Enzyme design. Sequence first.
Site, PDB file in Angstrom:
ATOM      1  CD  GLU A  71      -0.803   0.086   3.672  1.00  0.00           C
ATOM      2  OE1 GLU A  71      -1.343   1.331   3.541  1.00  0.00           O
ATOM      3  OE2 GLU A  71      -0.930  -0.845   4.532  1.00  0.00           O
ATOM      4  CG  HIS A 100      -9.161   4.357   6.784  1.00  0.00           C
ATOM      5  ND1 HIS A 100      -8.992   5.876   6.944  1.00  0.00           N
ATOM      6  CD2 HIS A 100      -7.510   3.989   6.931  1.00  0.00           C
ATOM      7  CE1 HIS A 100      -7.868   6.333   7.413  1.00  0.00           C
ATOM      8  NE2 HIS A 100      -7.105   5.340   7.566  1.00  0.00           N
TER       9      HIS A 100
END
Length: 108
Positions: A71, A100
Amino acid sequence: VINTFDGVADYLQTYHKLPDNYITKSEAQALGWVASKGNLADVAPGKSIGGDIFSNREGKLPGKSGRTWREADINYTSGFRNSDRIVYSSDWLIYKTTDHYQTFTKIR
């Protein structure tokens, strides 16, 4: 800095590496980043967090053997981290999340 969805996505599939404004979480902590005070921009001017392995335990990202998810933070300039992430694989698949990691959409 290169820190937009499209800019990072395109850099990644090309160079197979993150732009140079990215630093891992532990790297950032080494420099003095304390998540609670949102001071990343003060200890690591012009840097974003990115390059940490995303485990994918809620199985929502397409699994495969040999594949590893990573990520990177998107759109950050300063203050506390936002909710935007680029999720990339070993085989250059590119996904994004702006919530998120609840939900993901394919971008490359």
